[PDB]
Design a protein around this ligand. Structure first.
Ligand SMILES: [Zn+2]
Lengths: 39, 171, 187, 48
C-alpha cells in the first residue's frame, strides 16, 4: 500500500529487516533457481 | 432543569462540613435548613434519601441519619501504606493524589515519611498515582546495563533463527 | 505448570527487564487468558502509551497474540484481542537478549584495537602507522606527517581502552547470579 | 532514529520515523512514485 508491505495469511506489517534476514537465510543455490547470480 | 443541582449542592455542603471537621453526622432536614432547601418539594427529598444517598459512595448511613464515611478517606499515613499494600496484593492499582490530598491533611508530609516504600508516578493532569514497593524482592539496575540491553532487538531475530542459534551453540 | 518455570519467569522479568512492562506481566501471570480491553482496565494506563509498550512486546514476542471474532447481541462489528504468555517462546527470547549482550562487548573491544594509534592534532584525524612512516623521510631523520608538520603522539589512544576494560568486569559480576537461575530452569 | 532507538523511544514513534526514512530514501531514488506525495524544495518545485 504505497511503499509499505503487509503480510496477510492474521495480517501484520512486514518491516524491511524481516525480508533482509529471510534473504540472508536464503542459500546461494536457490539464487540460481530464482534466476539471480549469487556472486 | 429541576432537582439535580440541589443534590449536587448537598454533596458539596458535605465536603464543606468535612473541611470544617464535624465528624458527628447531621440530620438531612437540618442540612436543608442550612442550605436553604426548604423551598424544594418533600417528595424529591424522599427520593434522594431512598436512592441517591445510598448510591453516593462518600455518603454513609448511621443510626438512621446520613453522613460521610470516616473510614473511606485516609486519616493516617500508616493506614495509607497498609491500603497501598492491600491494593498491590489484590491488583486494585494506585489511588489519585488529589483525592488523597483532600482526604488527609499534610499528605505531602505523609509521602515524605513514606520515602522509598512509596512510589509516585506523574500524570499529564499532574495527578500522582502511588504504588507500594515489594519488600520480598529488591533489585538494582544500572544505566549502562539498561543501555546494553536496550540496543539489542529480538524483533530483528526470526523465531526459527532463534531455535537455530540454540541448536548451533551446542546445548 | 511446575513452579520452577514461574520462578524463572518472575526472577528474569523482575531483575533484568523494565518495571512498567513487569506491571503487565503481573496481569499475564494472574490470568492465562485476558481480553486486551480487560488488560487495559487492569493496567490503568493511557491507550497510546499502552500501545507503544504493546508494539515493543509484539516485536519481542514475549506474549503471544491471537485474534477472535464473535457476534454481539447488538450485532455491530467488534474486534477482540487476546494476549497470553507462552513459556516456551519467553525462555528463548530472554536467553537471546542475554546471549547477544556478550557479542556486543566482544565487538566493542574488537573495535578498540581496530582504531589507529597515531593521531595528529593539526590533522584532527586518526592516522595509520602505514601513512605515518611513509610521510617520514629518511633525509629529515624524524617521522612526522608531511601535511600538518607536527609530531604525532599515540598516548591519547591508550586511556579509553583501560576504562572500558574495567566496565566489562563489573558486568560479569552483575550477570553472575542469573545463570544459576537459568540452570534451575533447565533442571 | 538512532537517538530514538538509543533512548528506547515509543514503538509508534520509531515506526513513524522508519516510515519517514523509507519515504525519504525511496523519494531520493525516484520522486515520481505512484500515488505518493512529492518532495518539494520548500518553494513548490518538485525535487529531481
Ligand atoms: Zn599530521
Amino acid at each position: 500500500s504505497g511503499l509499505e508491505l503487509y503480510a496477510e495469511w492474521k495480517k501484520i506489517l512486514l518491516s524491511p529487516e524481516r525480508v533482509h534476514e529471510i534473504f540472508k537465510r536464503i542459500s546461494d543455490e536457490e539464487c540460481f533457481v530464482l534466476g539471480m547470480e549469487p556472486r | 432543569g429541576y432537582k439535580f443541582g440541589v443534590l449536587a449542592k448537598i454533596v458539596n455542603y458535605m465536603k464543606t462540613r468535612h473541611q470544617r471537621g464535624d465528624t458527628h453526622p447531621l440530620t438531612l432536614d437540618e442540612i436543608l435548613d442550612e442550605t436553604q432547601h426548604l423551598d424544594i418539594g418533600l417528595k424529591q427529598k424522599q427520593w434522594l434519601m431512598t436512592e441517591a444517598l445510598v448510591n453516593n459512595p462518600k455518603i454513609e448511613v448511621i443510626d438512621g441519619k446520613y453522613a460521610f464515611k470516616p473510614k473511606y478517606n485516609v486519616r493516617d499515613k500508616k493506614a495509607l501504606l497498609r491500603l497501598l499494600d492491600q491494593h498491590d496484593q489484590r491488583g486494585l492499582g494506585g489511588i489519585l493524589l488529589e483525592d488523597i490530598e483532600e482526604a488527609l491533611p499534610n499528605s505531602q508530609k505523609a509521602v515524605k515519611a513514606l520515602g522509598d516504600q512509596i512510589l509516585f508516578v506523574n500524570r499529564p493532569d499532574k495527578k500522582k498515582i502511588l504504588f507500594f514497593n515489594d519488600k520480598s524482592c529488591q533489585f538494582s539496575v544500572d544505566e549502562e546495563f539498561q543501555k546494553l540491553w536496550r540496543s539489542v532487538t529480538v524483533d530483528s531475530m526470526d523465531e526459527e533463527k532463534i531455535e537455530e542459534y540454540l541448536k548451533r551453540q551446542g546445548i | 505448570v511446575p513452579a520452577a518455570l514461574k520462578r524463572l519467569a518472575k526472577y528474569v522479568i523482575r531483575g533484568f527487564y523494565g518495571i512498567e512492562h513487569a506491571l503487565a506481566l503481573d496481569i499475564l501471570i494472574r490470568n492465562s487468558c485476558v481480553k486486551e480491553e480487560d488488560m487495559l482496565e487492569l493496567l490503568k494506563f493511557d491507550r497510546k502509551q499502552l500501545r507503544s509498550v504493546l508494539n515493543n512486546l509484539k516485536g519481542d514476542k514475549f506474549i503471544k497474540c491471537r485474534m477472535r471474532v464473535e457476534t454481539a447481541a447488538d450485532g455491530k462489528t467488534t474486534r477482540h484481542n487476546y494476549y497470553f504468555i507462552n513459556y516456551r517462546t519467553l525462555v528463548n527470547v530472554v536467553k537471546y537478549k542475554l546471549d547477544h549482550m556478550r557479542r556486543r562487548i566482544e565487538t566493542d573491544e574488537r573495535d578498540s584495537t581496530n582504531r589507529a594509534s597515531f593521531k595528529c592534532p593539526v590533522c584532527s584525524s586518526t592516522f595509520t602507522d602505514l601513512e605515518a612512516n611513509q610521510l617520514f623521510d629518511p633525509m629529515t631523520g624524524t617521522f612526522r606527517c608531511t601535511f600538518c608538520h607536527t609530531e604525532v603522539e599515540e598516548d591519547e589512544s591508550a586511556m579509553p581502552k583501560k576504562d572500558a576494560r574495567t566496565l566489562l568486569a563489573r558486568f560479569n559480576e552483575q550477570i553472575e547470579p542469573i545463570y544459576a537461575l537459568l540452570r534451575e530452569t533447565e533442571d | 532514529l538512532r537517538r530514538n532507538e538509543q533512548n528506547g523511544a515509543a514503538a509508534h514513534v520509531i515506526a513513524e520515523d522508519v516510515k519517514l526514512l523509507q519515504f525519504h530514501v525511496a523519494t531520493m531514488v525516484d520522486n515520481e512514485l505512484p500515488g505518493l506525495p512529492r518532495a518539494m524544495q520548500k518553494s513548490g518545485r518538485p525535487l529531481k
